[PDB]
């Protein structure tokens, strides 16, 4: 087998294979007897026409399909004996097929660069032991009751978490500008949509007040000479409205779906649900910082195949949410995702190398722990266990994720993984 | 107010307009389980909704003469297929079983297709959540969906 390899497109090596005329002539003739047996022409063969004659004349049509077949079978033949580690779509640049001469063609295919795993000590991870108490579950339930709070008017002392009805005079340098007021204007606190500090005046007065506060504009204000400029606002605070922490009635408790819809039942049920979500959240916490640090420790330029596979996945994932319109995905540029797509594949190669190097397999006690801790949310998860035993495509994937988790922990073994006993709302970053 | 000389015309200084545009009629009250939404009758079929509008002849035809059939929602369940149709949570994701679908058996190119932060949405939002007692919180339909399938 005559081949001429030249490293052209970096990882893309051009193994210019030359399939001999006899190899082609044999394979076309071998294909024609396959067609003859299929269509039963082999039985209708009178044997007065020699097979070399039908090979060149009638097999002239089939020459093309046999060439492409041979290119694929000479590719896999080549990479094994040449000890090459291939990658990408093998760019079969097909040279001119001279009928009777050799078919030369340049197979430009990429290679997999094996992952030079450097010091995993460079990785720094945090393991925050999130503790929960009755004050934490009740305080969180209080926050949820403030999300679902029925707001209603009151009169007298305003507080710093209310919303009110004012009527202000918008002024700069004490000069009221036109458009620059708002009458019966309902202003709410905490929300950083307004001017920073503008809510301040409201939060420390009565529902029968009129006063002018000194508050500075935002630097996000659409006037340079006015952005972060100290302005005057004659806040006519005419009403104040307070939230009502809703009724802790057992029927209201279970309205959310609290199956144990009692008071201590609300606290207990939401607690055991908190820990079950926090189980997966703490796993994702330590894992995400592991992966962050892993790639922060390690760099590899991946062949175009895997990156562009992830590009296409991310294009569909994006366009799905970006309208969901007909196939808009396929037009999104490589550079739209290239950095983070490469990053995704880099992790896949890092952990793939951890699997190979450390001979790290999916451990059945880790599959045990994973299934049971996930299904611990259920009292009797017959659905889950039976779905494994009746769908091995997910059951092996249960071992694949367990494989990846053990991979991460084997990397954590070398990594600077600090640990601390932290407050409840640590991983619970979003309350509003 | 709309002119060059600031005057909050280039940026409304008050960011809560309201303007009594749909003063709490329907944008205030939750319809609970979609009484007048999704299809039209949230529970029964009724069929007398369009009666006063024009006609009572379902709508046109569609599978099973539209969704006006009195009784027979469990198109499976009788033999063994479905077993319990939707099973409260409509399958959903976790109420089903699944934790990561994808197409790659023994792959490691997963990671970022559930991260939340610049990849999906949010960072767990594990502030309680709770009370996920099944609950039909995802799509629940049959007969004909997407390009004409059951």
Report the C-alpha gap between A213 and A235 in whole angstroms.
7
Name the experimental technique: NMR
Report B:114-143 residues touching A (Cβ under 8 A): 115, 118, 122-133, 135
Out of A221, A269, A427, closest to residue B11 by CB: A221
Q: Please provide the DSSP assignment of B76-105 as one string.
A: S-SSSSSSSSSTTTTSTTTTTS-S---S-T
Same domain? For A378 and A356 the reply is yes
Number of domains observed in the structure of chain A: 3
Comparing alpha-carbon positions, the chain A residue that sits nearest to B29 is: A150
Per DSSP (E only), the strands in A112-218 are: 124-130, 150-154, 163-172, 175-188, 211-216
Probe site for chain A from B109, B132, B134 (most A CB atoms < 10 A):
B109
Same domain? For A302 and A283 the reply is yes
- What is the pairing mode between strands A124-130 and A416-422? parallel
Report the C-alpha gap between A82 and A65 in whole angstroms.
26
Instruction: State both tokens at A287.
Output: 């894992």
User: Would an 8 Å CB–CB cutoff place B80 in contact with chain A?
Assistant: no
Determine contact, residues A411/A290, Cβ cutoff 8 Å: yes
Determine contact, residues A122/A90, Cβ cutoff 8 Å: no
Same domain? For A251 and A344 the reply is yes
Task: Decide which of A194, A229, A246 is a domain's last residue.
Answer: A246
Residues forming beta bridges with residue A422, ordered by sequence position: A130
Report the C-alpha gap between A44 and B138 in whole angstroms.
62
Phi and psi torsions of A336, nearest 5°: -65, -35
Instruction: State both tokens at A310.
Output: 């992830």
Phi-psi group of A135: left, alpha or beta (phi > 0 → left; psi -120 to 50 → alpha; rest → beta): alpha
Q: Which residues form the domain of A356?
A: 111-149+247-432
Same domain? For A119 and A141 the reply is yes
Report the C-alpha gap between A266 and A286 in whole angstroms.
29
Cβ contact A256–B111 (<8 Å): no
Same domain? For A140 and A252 the reply is yes
**Helical axes A392-412 vs A263-297, angle rounded to 10°:** 70
Same domain? For A346 and A430 the reply is yes
Chain A residues in contact with B98 (beta carbon < 8 A): 394
CATH number at residue A159: 3.10.50.40
Same domain? For A346 and A257 the reply is yes
Same domain? For A19 and A165 the reply is no
Residues forming beta bridges with residue A92, ordered by sequence position: A107
Chain B residues in contact with A177 (beta carbon < 8 A): 6-8
Query: What is the distance in angstroms between the CA of the first residue and the CA of the last residue of chain A?
Result: 68
Query: What is the distance in angstroms between the CA of the first residue and the CA of the last residue of chain B?
Result: 55
Cβ contact B130–A274 (<8 Å): yes
How many CB atoms neighbour CB A325 within 10 A? Answer: 9
Chain B residues in contact with A195 (beta carbon < 8 A): 13
User: Would an 8 Å CB–CB cutoff place B30 in contact with chain A?
Assistant: no
Cβ contact B132–A288 (<8 Å): no
CATH number at residue A51: 3.30.70.1050
Cβ contact A180–B8 (<8 Å): yes
Phi-psi group of A374: left, alpha or beta (phi > 0 → left; psi -120 to 50 → alpha; rest → beta): alpha
Same domain? For A327 and A432 the reply is yes
Determine contact, residues B58/B66, Cβ cutoff 8 Å: yes
Phi and psi torsions of A42, nearest 5°: -65, -35
Task: Decide which of A79, A110, A141 is a domain's last residue.
Answer: A110
Same domain? For A398 and A325 the reply is yes
Task: Decide which of A202, A221, A246 is a domain's last residue.
Answer: A246
Chain B residues in contact with A367 (beta carbon < 8 A): none
Set B60, B124, B127, B132: catalytic member: B124
Comparing alpha-carbon positions, the chain B residue that sits nearest to A171 is: B7
Per DSSP (E only), the strands in A173-325 are: 175-188, 211-216, 230-235, 239-244
Same domain? For A240 and A251 the reply is no
B4 is catalytic: no
Probe site for chain B from A394, A399, A406 (most B CB atoms < 10 A):
A394
Same domain? For A265 and A409 the reply is yes
């Amino acid at each position: 087998m005559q081949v001429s390899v030249e490293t052209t497109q970096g990882l893309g090596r051009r193994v210019t294979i030359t399939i001999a005329a006899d190899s082609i002539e044999t394979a076309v003739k071998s294909e024609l007897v396959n067609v003859a047996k299929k269509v039963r022409i082999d039985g209708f063969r009178k044997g007065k026409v020699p097979m070399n004659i039908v090979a060149q004349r009638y097999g002239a049509s089939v020459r093309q399909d046999v060439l492409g077949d041979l290119m694929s079978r000479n590719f896999i033949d080549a990479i094994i004996k040449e000890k090459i580690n291939p990658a990408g779509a093998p760019t079969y640049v097909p040279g001119e097929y001279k009928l009777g001469e050799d078919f030369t063609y340049s197979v430009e295919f990429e290679v997999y660069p094996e992952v030079e795993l450097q010091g995993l000590e460079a990785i720094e991870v945090e393991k925050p032991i999130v503790e929960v108490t009755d004050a934490d579950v009740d305080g969180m339930l209080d926050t949820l009751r403030k999300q679902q709070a029925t707001w209603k008017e009151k009169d007298g002392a305003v507080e710093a978490e209310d919303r009110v009805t004012i009527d202000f005079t918008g002024s700069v340098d004490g000069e009221e500008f036109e458009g620059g007021k708002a009458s019966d204007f309902v202003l709410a606190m905490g929300q950083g949509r307004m001017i920073p500090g503008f809510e301040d005046g409201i939060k420390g007065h009565k529902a029968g007040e009129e006063f002018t506060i000194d508050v500075t504009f935002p630097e996000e204000y659409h006037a340079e000479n006015l952005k972060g400029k100290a302005a005057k606002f004659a806040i006519n605070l005419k009403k104040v409205e307070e939230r009502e922490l809703p009724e802790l009635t057992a029927e209201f408790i279970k309205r959310f779906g609290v199956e144990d819809g009692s008071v201590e039942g609300l606290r207990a049920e939401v607690r055991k649900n908190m820990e079950r979500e926090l189980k997966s959240a703490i796993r994702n916490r330590v894992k995400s910082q592991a992966i962050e640090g892993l790639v922060k420790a390690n760099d590899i330029d991946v062949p175009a195949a895997l990156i562009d596979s992830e590009i296409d996945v991310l294009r569909r994932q994006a366009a799905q949410r970006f309208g969901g319109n007909e196939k808009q995905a396929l037009e999104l540029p490589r550079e739209l995702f290239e950095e983070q797509a490469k990053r995704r594949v880099v992790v896949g190669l890092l952990l793939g190398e951890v699997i190979r190097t450390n001979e790290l397999k999916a451990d059945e006690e880790r599959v045990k722990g994973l299934i049971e801790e996930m299904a611990s949310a259920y009292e009797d998860p017959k659905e889950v266990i039976e779905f494994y035993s009746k769908n091995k495509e997910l059951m092996d994937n249960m071992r694949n994720v367990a494989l990846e988790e053990q991979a991460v922990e084997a990397v954590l073994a070398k990594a600077k993984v600090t640990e601390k006993e932290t407050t409840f709302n640590e991983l619970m970053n979003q309350q509003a | 107010m709309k002119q060059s000389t600031i005057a909050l015309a280039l940026l409304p200084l008050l960011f809560t307009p309201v303007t009594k545009a749909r003063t709490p009629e329907m944008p205030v009250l939750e319809n609970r389980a979609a009484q007048g939404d999704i299809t039209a009758p949230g529970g029964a079929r009724r069929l007398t909704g369009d009666q006063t509008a024009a006609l009572r002849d379902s709508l046109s035809d569609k599978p099973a003469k539209n969704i006006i059939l009195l009784i027979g929602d469990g198109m499976g369940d009788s033999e063994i297929t479905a077993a319990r149709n939707y099973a409260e949570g409509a399958g959903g994701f976790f109420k089903g079983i699944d934790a990561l679908p994808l197409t790659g058996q023994y792959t490691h190119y997963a990671l970022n297709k559930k991260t939340g932060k610049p990849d999906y949405v949010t960072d767990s939002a594990a502030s309680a959540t709770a009370w996920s007692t099944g609950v039909k919180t995802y799509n629940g339909a049959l007969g004909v969906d997407i390009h004409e399938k059951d």
